[PDB]
Design a binder for this molecule. Structure first.
Ligand SMILES: [Mg+2]
Ligand SMILES: [Mg+2]
Lengths: 363, 361, 188
């Protein structure tokens, strides 16, 4: 058999929950292009996102601390957010292709040097419009990436752009909302894992957060030493915990709310995706813990200090001496302005290239 | 709405093509474990594979040539995309297909097919080395992530897929992944070859499909700029993907198979690109062999890889005491050579290079 | 002179152990493999699961004291019971007199066997050894096959001492860094 777009669109509807976004109800794309045969609107979006340059750089930008040296990578993170969100979405009868498309694209606008990047760039741009990673992702997918003759951007569906702009706020689709939740879940589980693997977190500290200790004690996990088998078991159980609670709590809110359409979610007075009172407490506890014991760890901070100096040295040099910029970037100044042109350029850099560019600027 | 696994399984059926593998018909797992609450068997397999150390290592092992060269992780994701597109169009189990695509390349040693070659040579007298079996070795024995059993305890169909893509013919899902790997390898090695400035915009005429696609779109065949290359790569993937969907649909209709069981026991493989596409793919792979893989610079790096793998193998083989105690500990049950092979094969490119460097003054 | 050799052994044992733990090659759980090690750590209430800095320092000092003491007592015994009344008598004695006594003697042996096995034959330690072996063998082959590569100063000693000896003396008198760099300078 051959399943056409039409057949898939029909199958999608009637299979998904009422409140889930059906691809056939899409508001469409900005620019007109022939509708494909075989691929669903979101399916196509997934395909384009995967081939963007920014998605590719994700493999050369790290999560948490700067690349240069075993710390996941923004790509590993994304794949994990994609796994958690799709998992939760399917359990809730939500649109999985929409969920996926959003998880794959939401972190495309991050500059090099995990999160530290966004804070320094936004600071350097205080009087010029600032800088925000969600807005940057959108800017890339609607303006900076040119892979199709006829228009700048990827010409993605309203729903995916909508997702990037509303997820991580009452608005957006349950799909989009599920992605932001998955992002938090993923961050927690994997930072914990990297924290330990990197010898930065110690087994004895697990007691500081009640969910972790509860899980270590329940599985007879060897503390003080927390061997890999035990680590892998703690991480998996933790992921299962939040995913399970996201499903049960979101299902609860969606039913109690009575929404029977994606439009209803979009318009509801609050967001439905939730963890439930106890899970939100655990995660919040886990978040504070990781920030204190991992992100603020001295070895992590000494790298963060370096990432800032690199971005600061790049920004100052290019903004003071635009003639140092590649001609292709100098060409964009009239249409974008000096600061934006410099900011887009630095933000599209990989950690490895930013450091190198920085180094080539000095004797 | 909460879709339990029992609901998902039932839904999956009636929805998928008759010749597609339904997870509710799984032959099961080697070891017992309770069932999931929401996830289907393949969904869980996809999950487990994603969290293996071998999957993580894909990100630090380049595909062909150990900067513009993509990693094995990127390759695997491209394989997963092509495979999933083709499977959805043919009404096949997408989770199974994806699960197989994420796992088929786990067994590669650092470096390229280069790695598997030298590794097999060394070892010719000790059982050999093949990347697909190494993949199964990893998923059923080498990775310990669960107490109660070694490996991942994956469903029969996923393991079968890695082995067949075990029995004779495998599921259509498995067959689709192999063809996807070929299409993927081809379009992206061509892209990387150009990005690396190894292939030049004029050698495009050496393969009819490339020349045809480029002429038909008005591409600058003299200085193949970025946008033009991207257009070409996309059309290339587009062309082969369509061929595969159409030709496979035909084979499947011709065959009359009405189940996955029918697909496994069928005299031949059903997944196909058809006469014409099968022809262009061949020509292309041949061109890539000649102008990319055998390009002098690429061969220089091939040389160095062979030297790193051979140095480590001889070192740990001639002096097992140089191996981590954890590996030395597996020697009794595995044998020196195999334990040493598993260790090297599980390395990332940089770890292997550094290890080899540390063996010298 | 006899005391110096016994003090060398005591020193080796104690310091190798210290360096072993510091370097992260010896783990606090392996102390159980040496009765003396266990008895001291247990008798002082040390942290045998994780041997923190303070605890290791207590372990090493107590180990040294155990041997310094045993050495003093046992040697007094053997010296008295032998009746030596002069340095000349110690020399002409049918046996060596500096000793540790039975208990300390086997403890130290069990300790040396444990350091041999766990620290000296440690994968990482064995690797730097093979490398060190390569350097010296490289230097030796290079200078004897090609004497002209030697400093003029050393080349001049060849008539007096012979090629092999002159080269051996030159290699033996080198610092670690100079030997490594000398080896590196022989290749491209
Ligand atoms: Mg994120
Ligand atoms: Mg492959």
């Amino acid at each position: 058999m051959r399943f056409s777009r039409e057949a898939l669109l029909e199958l999608e509807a009637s299979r998904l929950a009422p409140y889930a976004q059906k691809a056939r109800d899409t508001r469409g794309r900005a620019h007109p292009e022939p509708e494909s045969l075989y691929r669903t609107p979101y399916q196509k979006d997934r395909d384009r996102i995967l081939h963007t340059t920014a998605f590719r750089r994700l493999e050369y930008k790290t999560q948490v601390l700067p690349g240069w040296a075993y710390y996941r990578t923004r790509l590993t993170h994304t794949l994990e957010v994609a796994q958690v969100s799709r998992s939760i979405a399917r359990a809730l009868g939500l649109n999985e292709d929409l969920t996926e498309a959003i998880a794959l694209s939401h972190d495309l606008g991050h500059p090099p040097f995990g999160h530290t990047g966004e804070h320094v760039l936004n600071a350097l741009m205080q009087d010029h419009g600032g800088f925000e990673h969600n807005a940057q992702a959108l800017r890339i997918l609607t303006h900076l990436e040119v892979r199709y003759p006829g228009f700048r951007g990827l010409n993605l569906t309203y729903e995916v752009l909508e997702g990037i702009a509303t997820h991580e706020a009452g608005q957006g689709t349950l799909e989009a909302q599920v992605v932001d939740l998955s992002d938090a879940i993923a961050y927690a589980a994997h930072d914990l894992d990297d924290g330990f693997r990197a010898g930065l977190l110690h087994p004895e500290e697990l007691k500081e957060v009640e969910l972790l200790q509860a899980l270590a004690l329940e599985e007879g996990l060897d503390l003080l030493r927390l061997p890999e088998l035990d680590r892998r078991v703690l991480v998996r159980q933790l992921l299962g915990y939040f995913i399970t609670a996201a499903i049960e709590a979101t299902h609860r809110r969606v039913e109690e709310a009575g929404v029977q359409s994606a439009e209803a979610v979009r318009r509801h007075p609050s967001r439905l995706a939730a963890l439930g009172e106890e899970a939100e407490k655990a995660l919040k506890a886990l978040k504070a813990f990781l920030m204190e014991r991992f992100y603020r760890h001295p070895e992590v901070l000494r790298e963060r200090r370096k990432a800032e100096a690199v971005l600061e040295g790049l920004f100052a040099a290019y903004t003071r001496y635009p003639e140092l910029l590649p001609r292709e970037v100098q060409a964009k100044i009239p249409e974008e302005g000096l600061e934006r042109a410099v900011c887009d350029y630095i933000a599209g850099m990989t950690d490895r290239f930013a450091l190198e560019a920085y180094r080539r600027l000095s004797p």
